[PDB]
Each structure stands twice: as C-alpha cells, then as structure tokens.
C-alpha cells in the first residue's frame, strides 16, 4: 500500500535517467540492466527519505 506508488516512481525515475545517460554518454553503457537496478534501489531508499519531510514533528 505505502509502497504501491513508491515502486512506480522509482521505476519511472530509473528508466528516464538511464535513457538520458545512454543518449548523452561518450561511452556505451554496458549492462544497463545492472545500472538501472542500482538506480532503482537507490531511488527507492531516497524516495522513502523524501516522503518523510512531510510531518516529522
């Protein structure tokens, strides 16, 4: 429930960041599957931090 939209947002972030990296990288980005996953796990953890600036009083 709380992660229903946390994942979708991490997925959207990971896909768009990768497509830009590939199109703007002088190096062919190898094993982009692994790249996305690091971005997606990092996206998830930091999405859970971003959400917490809501009401931590």
């Amino acid at each position, epitope marked *: 429930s709380m992660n229903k939209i946390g994942d979708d947002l991490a997925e959207t972030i990971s896909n768009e960041l990768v497509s830009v990296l*590939q*199109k*703007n*990288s*002088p*190096t*062919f*980005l*190898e094993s*982009s599957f692994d790249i996305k996953s690091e971005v997606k796990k990092h996206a998830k953890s930091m999405l859970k931090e971003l959400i917490k600036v809501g009401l931590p009083s």
Partner: antibody
Amino acid sequence: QVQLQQSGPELVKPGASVKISCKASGYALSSSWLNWVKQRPGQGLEWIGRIFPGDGDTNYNGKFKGKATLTADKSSSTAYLQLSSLTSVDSAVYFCARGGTVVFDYWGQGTTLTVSS
Amino acid sequence: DIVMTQSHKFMSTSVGDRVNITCKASQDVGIAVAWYQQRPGQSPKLLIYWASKRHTGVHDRFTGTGSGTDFTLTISTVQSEDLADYFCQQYSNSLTFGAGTTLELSR
C-alpha cells in the same frame, strides 16, 4: 556473440553515390550511437557522423556534412551511410562502430570504396 | 581544429620488453583520450578510454597514462599479438585521431 556486419566493397565513378549498410546484433541499437569513420590509404583516421537510431538524431563533421547523410531502420537493426559527390579523395575503408558519442567500444569490419573513372 | 600527432611512425621493441607509444596534442584535451589497436587486415579495437581506463577485456599489460597535451600507452610485456598499429584520439570538444604508430620487431 556481438558483431556488426557491413555491406561489401563498392566501385563508383566520380560524381556518383553509394549506400553502405551496417547491421547490428548482440545489442540494441535503440540504446546506442552508431558512428562512421574514414580510414584512408595514408592511414589517417577521420570521423564522419553518428546517429542515435532510437530517436534518429544525427551529428556530422563540418567536413562531410555537405555530402554524407545517415539514416537507420530500427526494425532491421541496420544503419545506412550514404555518400554523394564521390571522388578519389573519398576512396577509403569505411568502418561503422558501436559506442556512445565518442568512445568506439566495438568496430565492424569495414567497407572498401574505390572511386575511379 | 585540435591536432593529435604521433611523433614516431614506428617504435622498435621485442617480445618480453616494455614499450611506450606516445601521442602529442596541440591543445589541452584534458583526459579525453582513447587508444586503439589495429592489426593488419583487421578493424580497430579499443584499449584505453579517458586516457587511463581499460576497456572490458583489456589485459593488464595495457597501462595507459596521461592528461593534457602529452599521453602514453605503456605495454608492460610485448607479445606477438601486440605487433600492430596504434592510434590515439581526443574528444575534449571535438574528435581528432592521430595518424598512428606502428610497432615493429627490433633486429
């Protein structure tokens, strides 16, 4: 295995034109740039142009922009290099190379273009 | 445009020895330099990019160096496979290749 297969050797008269093909396998062209490079008999290596066939955006050297054009067919994993206004100067071996914008992580086998009357 | 000049059209060496293929740039190209090998009859292969980083599959022998207007490609131990042509490339703002260095056997 990853490889790039190019069309065969070409003979053109001066003033005529060619289309050199470059088929890709082992990876997705829609996630990469394909670059074209001129290697002449004097061994000097020159860069021509690249295309990002996922979008189709192109970039050219000012030396070849006038007569070199790049197109691609995503559904056939094939990029095409078209050369007009041929002359003995343009007679060289033409490689197509995978990579990003710059660093060519894998090269094809090259197409030999001989231009003569 | 920026010019990459490989002073030595040829370098002399022998199997088991070290060798330095050098490349001189006309303008500051940062670390944006790539090195390629080309055996006769073959198309080029990448050895070094960003002037010191090995491409996947490149053996420890190929120890590239440099920033600025001076660069090097140290082969720690020369094999028969290494008797080939060597090119440098700069991509700081635009692409330029050198004209190549050809590694020969000394006698």
